[PDB]
């Protein structure tokens, strides 16, 4: 009996993170979750925008990556589907026509800003050739807060897993979980909801089997490492990959088997008090991202996180095309967004319909 | 998507008539919402717009002045309307008319308030229109 008097957070049992954020960030990420709606990710990098841009044929620029936000941002209405946007760090600093920055906007019609706090991939290093780790830990607590302070309640961190020969290295499925928590911890010190990303791309042959198998390992060794970081549950988002068969794998998979393997997997490793799971939409058509939303929200297997959407080119093609970047095309480039974004609000219900889909659009 | 509008009519020079607004999926709450009107040969023109609503002070409205102290333009968010009540109608009133949502978000921050405009450029979502003939 030898003993000593220690602090309670020394003890492993105590290691659940202490925030004065708790209560705002479970609130918000109730706002974030609620029925019919979902988030709009607009946080693609100026790299990203070339590639967009590349179709339409226009430049470049701040400014017309402020018009291309602004398209969406200023479009009347989004609000009744969009619960949050996701930012890219140039746009939360721009302004709208109205006279507000794009956050105040937001707020103003009760929609959560945020931003995306990685700071890009880079390569692994450890494990095979092609994975990739992410940047952005130093400096973290200084870049979340000043995003707080213009407004933003909840960010975006993106992990990727290639999946190569049917599997992925046991390197990569540890360290980019320990970075993932890590973000996760620091965001919510600071006051922002993670989103958090463990994306298991959809490049490669590999076929649904095999992304089951590897997305289920994958995202039980993320929330492993949620849990020994002590990220507070219940104020923290999954932004997944659906499991679907690899881009060049050739095999068919319909919405319901998509929705059967994905909510199997998420039923499997997902801690119920996390509020809700925010799909990335990475590699699906506009329709297929609805349809196999749509699915998941029909599944009769366990899902009491909400299952929604966290959509980038899903929600904005269409609405891209029809714009083409000039003046005159901001009615069609907002009816096509107003379209998609109306499409997976149903899908997040579990009541959208594909011919109903063709119909609207066709006009 | 199509708002529909009703009240349309027949009436003698004097006479009123209250058209309505109504979208069946959309909730009208979030947009500026404007009347427009078409007479035979003549461009389609805007006759009154709604803001949506604010805080305190409530929607702010602006009508054509052909129609300035005859009609009033109101909003009912709850049933999810916006209503035109035309008084003291007059032949050239006569045309058919249409409701449309403002599709830009008219929110001017210098002076705290949504607002909306009579100018069609930015709306969408016609109806099919309700036709008003005023004759003796």
């Known amino acids: 009996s030898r003993r000593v008097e220690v602090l309670l957070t020394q003890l492993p049992a105590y290691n659940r993170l202490k925030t004065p954020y708790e209560e705002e960030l479970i609130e918000t990420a109730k706002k974030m979750t609620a029925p019919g709606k979902g988030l709009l990710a607009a946080d693609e990098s100026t790299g990203s925008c070339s590639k967009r841009f590349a179709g339409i044929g226009l430049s470049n620029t701040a400014e017309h990556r402020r018009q291309y936000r602004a398209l969406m941002l200023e479009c009347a209405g989004f609000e009744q589907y969009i619960s949050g946007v996701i930012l890219h760090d140039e746009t939360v600093y721009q302004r709208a026509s109205t006279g507000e920055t794009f956050p105040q906007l937001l707020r103003r019609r009760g929609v959560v800003p945020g931003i995306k706090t990685d700071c890009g991939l880079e390569p692994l290093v450890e494990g095979a050739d092609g994975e990739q780790m992410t940047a952005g830990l130093d400096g973290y607590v200084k870049r979340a807060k000043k995003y707080y302070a213009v407004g933003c309640r909840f960010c975006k961190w993106r992990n990727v897993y290639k999946i190569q020969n049917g599997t992925v290295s046991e390197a990569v499925v540890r360290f980019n979980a320990e970075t993932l928590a890590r973000y996760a911890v620091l965001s919510q010190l600071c006051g922002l909801v993670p989103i958090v990303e463990p994306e298991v791309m959809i490049d490669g042959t590999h076929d649904i089997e095999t992304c089951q198998r590897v997305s289920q390992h994958v995202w039980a060794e993320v929330v492993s490492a949620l849990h020994r970081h002590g990220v507070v549950w219940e104020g923290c988002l999954l932004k997944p990959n659906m499991v679907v068969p690899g881009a060049e794998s050739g095999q068919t998979a319909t919405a319901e088997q998509v929705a059967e393997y994905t909510v199997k997997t998420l039923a499997r490793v997902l801690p119920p008090a996390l509020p809700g799971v925010t799909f990335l939409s990475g590699g699906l058509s506009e329709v297929m991202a609805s349809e196999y939303l749509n699915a998941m929200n029909n599944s009769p297997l366990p899902r009491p996180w909400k299952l929604t959407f966290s959509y980038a080119r899903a929600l904005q093609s269409s609405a891209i095309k029809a714009w083409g970047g000039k003046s005159s095309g901001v009615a069609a480039g907002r009816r096509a967004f107003m379209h998609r974004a109306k499409m997976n609000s149903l899908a997040q219900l579990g009541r959208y319909n594909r011919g109903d889909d063709d119909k609207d659009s066709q006009s | 998507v199509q708002l529909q509008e009703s009240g349309g009519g027949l009436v003698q020079p004097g006479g009123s008539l209250r058209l309505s607004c109504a979208a069946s999926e959309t909730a009208l709450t979030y947009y500026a919402i404007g009347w427009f009107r078409q007479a035979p040969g003549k461009e389609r023109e805007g006759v009154s717009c709604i803001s949506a609503i604010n805080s305190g002070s409530g929607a702010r409205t602006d009508y054509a002045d052909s129609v300035k102290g005859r009609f009033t333009i109101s909003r009912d968010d709850a049933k999810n309307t916006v209503t035109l009540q035309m008084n003291s109608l007059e032949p050239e009133d006569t045309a058919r008319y249409y409701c449309?949502?403002?599709?830009?978000?008219?929110?001017?921050?210098?002076?705290?308030?949504?607002?909306?405009?009579?100018?069609?450029?930015?709306?969408?979502?016609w109806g099919q229109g309700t036709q008003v003939t005023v004759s003796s």
């Open positions: 449309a949502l403002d599709t830009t978000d008219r929110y001017d921050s210098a002076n705290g308030r949504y607002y909306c405009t009579i100018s069609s450029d930015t709306y969408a979502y």
